[PDB]
Amino acid sequence: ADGDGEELARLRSVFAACDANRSGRLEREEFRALCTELRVRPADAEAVFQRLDADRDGAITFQEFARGFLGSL
Amino acid sequence: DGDGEELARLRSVFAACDANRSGRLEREEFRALCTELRVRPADAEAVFQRLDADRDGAITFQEFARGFLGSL
Ligand SMILES: [Ca+2]
Ligand SMILES: [Ca+2]
Ligand SMILES: [Ca+2]
Ligand SMILES: [Ca+2]
């Protein structure tokens, strides 16, 4: 219980820190921009983004982000 | 403040990824987070190798943020 609770808190913390524009989603441009700051190349950034953006609308919701963890409960 | 706020963001991302509170992103905990996010293991390992510049199996904050820190 507490372990899963902590992991959800952890995922939200990562998501929120990534979400520089405070939209509640990870838009493509801000995701790319962070990857670039971390020196990850655009093809890798896009590979990871296209994967997370399940519905291909150009922004990763927290549902999409934590799909794997939430589906595992 | 713009830069200071970016540093805080990078520090927050890093802290959240360091689940075992080692001060570093060990390959194991890094990969496990990527597995959790449903990221393909080859994409995960590529991003880990990119960050782990000295190739010791753990990402320091100096390594993680070297692009930001060195552009200051
Ligand atoms: Ca956003
Ligand atoms: Ca989406
Ligand atoms: Ca660690
Ligand atoms: Ca290292």
Q: Please state the domain extents for chain A.
A: 1-73
Give the ligand whose atoms come closest to the C-alpha of residue A62: 2
User: Is residue B71 marked as binding?
Assistant: no
Superfamily of domain A1-73: EF-hand (1.10.238.10)
Using what technique was this structure determined?
Answer: X-ray
| Residue A37 CA: distances (Å) to CA of A42, B64, B72 | 11, 9, 12
With tokens 């190349």, the residue in question is A41
Residue type, A5: G
| Residue A56 CA: distances (Å) to CA of A51, A62, A64, B26, B28 | 9, 14, 11, 31, 29
Residues of B in contact with A51 (CB under 8 A): 38-40, 43
Rg of the Cα trace of chain B? 12
Residues of A in contact with B12 (CB under 8 A): 13, 16-17
Residue type, B2: G
Residues of B in contact with A14 (CB under 8 A): 13, 16-17, 33
Where on the phi/psi map is residue B71: left (φ > 0), alpha (ψ -120 to 50), or beta? Answer: alpha
- Taking the C-alpha atoms of residue A17 and residue A23, their distance in angstroms, rounded to an integer, is 12
> Resolution, in Å, please?
2.3
Select from A19, A39, A73 the residue whose CB has the most chain B CBs within 10 Å, as the one to mutate to test that interface: A39
CB B66 within 8 A of CB B7: no
| Residue B48 CA: distances (Å) to CA of A22, A72, B32, B53, B57 | 26, 24, 12, 9, 9
Cβ burial B18-36 (10 Å sphere, 16+ → b, else e): bbeeeebbbbebbbebbeb
How distant is the Cα of A3 from the closest Cα of chain B, in angstroms? 11
Q: What is the CATH number that goes with domain B1-72? A: 1.10.238.10
